[PDB]
């Protein structure tokens, strides 16, 4: 290589190089002071200012300090404000600013930086692709979609843009439309396309349209390290946790929880029925595009290890019962919820996001015929007052063809091989 020195900076290259050498040697404190003296003496120097920002960035890593990094993020912007900044340096500085803003979770700030980059460099396709990612991270799929349409209108065979456009189409339930974009994008091999999310959704889109090639893409995703197996396709994993579709209570070790659920199942049922009769707006429809058809809703008591206080007013006895079991109430990668499913419902094959939980089902109102659940290659039925346990990071599928409603209680637990230290530190999902 990059051309980082403007006319004046070439005249002080020896000083600039000496400060950078301290930084590259890991003498971060000395490099900070070296670049501070250069910023003091040469306040308009873009290379000195970038050196200051890079040292602050390194110092933030050493101290693991969000606030030190915020300083670096500001100095990266100061580089761009200076006169006569070389194009290579301007781009490097603002790209790192946006990257570090995302690391901090400042997604709206990163978006502003990315918009500025695209305005400054209107012909850099990769910066537009990065702007689309900025929109995806803040949940603005509509503006992300417009960005990738702009990219594809000029570079129709950009593989990054194809896979991301395909991802957006798939999220919008444009299943058939998504498949060629996801497929061609992965096949491009372009940087950023060899990503578990795109294999996951390409295979899933193919399954939904009945294309038997779906599992070839799962096999390839497994070969490329994205999935533990073709059956277990979660993307947020602790490697090596025992992996099996169906579990017994004894295998989980959570036998006291299972006994409480089975001894007290009727109070849990009765509170669910009272909500169905008198507070039915507490049941919220499934909203993750997982149904082919039918009606399926959940009344959630805990999510991400946090009690919903107003929800627990609707099931106070059940919430009191469950408070005794931190293996589920503290499962920050799971939920506790009632789940009602009505006749005419088919839930598409799907997998959950993480291998870090197991999912218990307590039967509450189970029609004698018509309801079943498949996990991997094995299908089972529920029983009233009895717990089933499976690992929902394995592909699973559900049918409801009874002649009345089916009510279960879903209780997620930490995978039993996770240590207390892991259960305290894993990011919530």
């Amino acid at each position: 290589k990059p051309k980082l020195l403007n006319k004046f900076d070439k005249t002080i290259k020896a000083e600039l190089d000496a400060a950078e050498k301290l930084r590259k040697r890991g003498k971060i404190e000395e490099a900070v002071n070296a670049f501070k003296e250069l910023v003091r003496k040469y306040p308009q120097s873009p290379r000195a200012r970038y050196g200051k920002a890079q040292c602050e960035d390194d110092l933030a890593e050493k101290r693991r300090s969000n606030e030190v990094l915020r300083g670096a993020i500001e100095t990266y912007q100061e580089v761009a404000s200076l006169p006569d900044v070389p194009a290579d340096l301007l781009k490097l500085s603002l790209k790192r600013r946006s990257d570090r803003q995302q690391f901090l979770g400042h997604m709206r700030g990163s978006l502003l930086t990315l918009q500025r980059l695209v305005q400054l460099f209107p012909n850099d396709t990769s910066l537009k692709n990065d702007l689309g990612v900025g929109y995806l991270l803040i949940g603005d799929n509509d503006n992300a979609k417009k960005v990738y349409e702009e990219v594809l209108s000029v570079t129709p065979n950009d593989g990054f843009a194809k896979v991301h456009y395909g991802f957006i189409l798939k999220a919008q339930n444009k299943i058939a439309e998504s498949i060629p974009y996801l497929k061609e994008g992965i096949e491009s091999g372009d940087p950023g396309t060899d990503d578990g999310r795109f294999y996951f959704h390409l295979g899933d889109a193919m399954q939904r349209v009945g294309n038997k090639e779906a599992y070839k893409w799962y096999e390839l995703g497994h070969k490329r390290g994205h999935f533990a197996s073709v059956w277990q396709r979660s993307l947020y994993n602790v490697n090596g946790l025992k992996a099996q579709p169906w579990w017994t209570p004894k295998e989980t070790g959570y036998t006291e929880l299972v006994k409480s659920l089975e001894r007290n199942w009727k109070l849990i049922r009765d509170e669910g029925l009272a909500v169905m009769d008198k507070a039915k707006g507490l049941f919220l429809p499934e909203d993750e595009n997982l149904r082919e058809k039918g009606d399926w809703s959940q009344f959630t008591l805990w999510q991400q290890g946090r009690r919903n206080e107003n929800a627990c007013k609707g099931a106070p006895k059940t919430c009191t019962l469950l408070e005794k079991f931190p293996e589920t109430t503290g499962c920050r990668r799971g939920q506790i919820k009632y789940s009602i499913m009505h006749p005419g419902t088919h839930v598409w094959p799907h997998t959950g996001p993480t291998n870090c939980r197991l999912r218990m089902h307590l039967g509450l109102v189970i029609p004698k015929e018509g309801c079943k659940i498949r996990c991997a290659n094995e299908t089972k039925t529920w029983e009233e007052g009895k717990v089933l346990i499976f690992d929902d990071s394995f592909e699973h599928e559900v049918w409801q063809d009874a002649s009345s409603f089916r009510l279960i209680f879903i209780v997620d637990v930490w995978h039993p091989e996770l240590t207390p230290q892991q259960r305290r530190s894993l990011p919530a999902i």
Partner: peptide, 19 residues
Amino acid sequence: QGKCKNGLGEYTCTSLEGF
């Protein structure tokens, strides 16, 4: 974004908080 409660429908499933 929403949350990945039961699947992998969101672009990312975790919330970033730096260090």
